[PDB]
Design an enzyme around this catalytic site. Structure first.
Site, PDB file in Angstrom:
ATOM      1  N   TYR A 126       0.817  -1.182   0.000  1.00 46.40           N
ATOM      2  CA  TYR A 126       0.000   0.000   0.000  1.00 46.40           C
ATOM      3  C   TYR A 126       0.886   1.281   0.000  1.00 46.40           C
ATOM      4  O   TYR A 126       1.863   1.344   0.672  1.00 46.40           O
ATOM      5  CB  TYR A 126      -0.990   0.001   1.117  1.00 46.40           C
ATOM      6  CG  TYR A 126      -2.108  -0.941   0.985  1.00 46.40           C
ATOM      7  CD1 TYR A 126      -3.240  -0.612   0.262  1.00 46.40           C
ATOM      8  CD2 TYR A 126      -2.074  -2.169   1.616  1.00 46.40           C
ATOM      9  CE1 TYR A 126      -4.266  -1.487   0.139  1.00 46.40           C
ATOM     10  CE2 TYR A 126      -3.095  -3.027   1.523  1.00 46.40           C
ATOM     11  CZ  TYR A 126      -4.200  -2.707   0.781  1.00 46.40           C
ATOM     12  OH  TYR A 126      -5.190  -3.594   0.695  1.00 46.40           O
ATOM     13  N   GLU A 127       0.538   2.244  -0.825  1.00 45.57           N
ATOM     14  CA  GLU A 127       1.290   3.471  -1.013  1.00 45.57           C
ATOM     15  C   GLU A 127       0.549   4.851  -0.757  1.00 45.57           C
ATOM     16  O   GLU A 127       1.107   5.901  -0.893  1.00 45.57           O
ATOM     17  CB  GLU A 127       2.046   3.419  -2.352  1.00 45.57           C
ATOM     18  CG  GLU A 127       2.930   2.156  -2.577  1.00 45.57           C
ATOM     19  CD  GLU A 127       3.768   2.162  -3.862  1.00 45.57           C
ATOM     20  OE1 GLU A 127       3.652   3.041  -4.663  1.00 45.57           O
ATOM     21  OE2 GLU A 127       4.553   1.276  -4.069  1.00 45.57           O
TER      22      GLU A 127
END
Length: 275
Positions: A126-127
């Site tokens: 996840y970014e």
């Protein structure tokens, strides 16, 4: 020795597992499937509160191909990466309705995917965190890995942070340090100007932030500049790390991009590891 190969993104490459050179002397070769995402399959893409869908191409990277590659190469394991940057054109934002509800959905959906594809591990990628907070993320991911390991569904887990997301990942790491096996730090995040000395400074910074976590080095084979390029001194830095007892492994983004360089980099890096 550990070598990690991301695969299945960008989309429509056509690259097969069997296309990628696998050095038989590598102790642990890990394929990493990209990505499983908790967003709706079709546009517009919206969040599903931890109900994972498969965004790689199962007709190319399927359960039979996975079995065959593993059978041919006893050093090979396969994992799946969660999240990624984008789905279609929509940014992938970590979102939980509640911790309990997200975790329940994630465990059910991932357990099915992992068993079905014959997988050995997961990776956390996840970014974007604009609709969440660090504790909520740490708790959701920490409970998911811990559960999956306890149920015997996975052997290993990794995280793939970079400086702009360090706050989120550090919360997860400090809260659940025994659940995370290694850290595939995304060195391609730094500027194209980064020197050999600066890269080494970045590595030591990462090792310190994630104290007692094992941090892998990395490069991109993509068409866009990022970090210390693979053939412009990355191997010099890698060599200093190796001499010092500091080289945990090398991670590559991605097999799909590498088709254009004919996997020359995958072959170079594996040979380097084993020498």
């Amino acid at each position: 020795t550990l070598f990690v190969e991301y695969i299945g993104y960008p989309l429509f490459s056509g690259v097969k597992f069997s296309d990628v050179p696998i050095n038989p002397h590598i102790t642990k070769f890990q394929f990493v499937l990209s990505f499983a995402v908790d967003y709706t399959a079709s546009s517009p893409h919206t969040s599903t509160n931890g109900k994972f869908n498969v965004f790689w191409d199962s007709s190319i990277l399927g359960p039979d191909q996975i079995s065959a590659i593993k059978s041919s190469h006893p050093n090979v394991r396969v994992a799946v990466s969660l999240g990624g940057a984008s789905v279609g054109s929509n940014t992938v934002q970590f979102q939980a309705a509640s911790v309990d509800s997200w975790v329940s959905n994630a465990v059910t959906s991932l357990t099915r995917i992992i068993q079905r594809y014959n997988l050995d591990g997961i990776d956390i990628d996840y970014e974007h965190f604009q609709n969440t907070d660090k504790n909520t993320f740490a708790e959701c991911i920490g409970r998911l890995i811990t559960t999956l390991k306890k149920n015997g569904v996975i052997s290993f887990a990794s995280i793939s942070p970079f400086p702009s997301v360090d706050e989120y990942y550090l919360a997860l790491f400090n809260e659940y340090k025994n659940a995370i096996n290694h850290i595939n730090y995304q060195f391609k995040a730094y500027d194209s100007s980064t020197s050999v000395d600066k890269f080494l400074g970045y590595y030591n910074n990462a090792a310190s932030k994630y104290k007692g976590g094992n941090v892998l080095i990395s490069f991109s084979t993509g068409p866009h500049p990022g970090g210390l390029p693979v053939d412009k001194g990355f191997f010099d830095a890698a060599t200093s790390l190796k001499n010092k007892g500091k080289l945990h492994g090398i991670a590559v983004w991605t097999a799909d991009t590498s088709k254009s360089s004919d996997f020359r980099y995958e072959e170079e890096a594996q040979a380097f590891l084993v020498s």
